[PDB]
């Protein structure tokens, strides 16, 4: 059971008046545990999961100080990027950043990341070896030359392989009751007649965690994708996820169809067949 910790940062410039809108969220696997919203009254990093509330004042003061420093960097970036791309000061732009680390099944460092986007497109990203950079264009190339000279990769590598992993493990233990528990999907099938000769079978997977999952339809033991529909995995709102897959079949032939559900919380894949 590998795990990860990730931080997402979004900054939107507001030329009309004031500073950029800055929003940061932290996640452990698919569980959000912190957030910061420059628009909120506290102006502090805030908890979003019970198990992070255990952390003392020093934790929250440090995280708050650091996240504010992040917003200022993004504020500066928005200006620097406006220049690089020779853009007007009147339009609103967006800088996004994501970084974090994964620990493998051995609970040891597996991989780290640190990527950046401008107006929704890759800008610059730390490569897997955590020593080189991927720059999407010439604006990002100038940034890359600057970060190489300042040895930014070395400083990040230290955090991603050390601090990042250490805290991820700390959080995993503190919130083990949920973070190290898998919630198997609760499944069932519904039947809806769409005509006198056709019917829709919908296979449901509810209240599962983590979000990763696979739903597949088979007809007489073989995968079928035509006449099917699978919606994107969506949050239930209570920390778990939902998904469904449907297939249109000839009324009276429902029995030939089986829905297959694969999920980490299942010792073996589940197979559903209509009544």
């Amino acid at each position: 059971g590998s795990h990860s910790m990730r931080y997402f940062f979004t900054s939107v410039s507001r030329p009309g008046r004031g500073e950029p809108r800055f929003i940061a969220v932290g996640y452990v696997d698919d569980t959000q545990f912190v957030r910061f919203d420059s628009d909120a009254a506290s102006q502090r990093m805030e908890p979003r999961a019970p198990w992070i509330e255990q952390e003392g004042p020093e934790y929250w003061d440090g995280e708050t100080r650091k996240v504010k420093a992040h917003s200022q960097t993004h504020r500066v970036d928005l200006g620097t990027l406006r220049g690089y791309y020779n853009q007007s000061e009147a339009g609103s732009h967006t800088v996004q950043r994501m970084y974090g680390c994964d620990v493998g099944s051995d609970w040891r460092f597996l991989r780290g990341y640190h990527q950046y986007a401008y107006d929704g497109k890759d800008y610059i990203a730390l490569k897997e070896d955590l020593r080189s950079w991927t720059a999407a264009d010439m604006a990002a190339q100038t940034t890359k030359h600057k970060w190489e000279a300042a040895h930014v990769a070395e400083q990040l590598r230290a955090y991603l392989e050390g601090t990042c992993v250490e805290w991820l493990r700390r959080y995993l233990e503190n919130g083990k009751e949920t973070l190290q528990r898998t919630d198997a999907p609760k499944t069932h099938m519904t039947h809806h007649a769409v005509s006198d000769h056709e019917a829709t079978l919908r296979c449901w997977a509810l209240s599962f965690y983590p979000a990763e999952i696979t739903l597949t339809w088979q007809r007489d033991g073989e995968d079928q994708t035509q006449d099917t529909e699978l919606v994107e995995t969506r949050p239930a709102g209570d920390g778990t996820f939902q998904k469904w897959a449907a297939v249109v079949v000839p009324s009276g032939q429902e029995q030939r169809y089986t829905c297959h559900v694969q999920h980490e919380g299942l010792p073996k894949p589940l197979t559903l067949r209509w009544e």
Binding site: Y7, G26, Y59, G62, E63, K66, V67, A69, H70, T73, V76, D77, T80, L81, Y84, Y99, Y116, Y123, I124, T143, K146, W147, A150, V152, Q155, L156, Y159, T163, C164, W167
Partner: peptide, 9 residues
Amino acid sequence: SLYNTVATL
């Protein structure tokens, strides 16, 4: 826990 130093673009 967040990273400490943030380098600018």
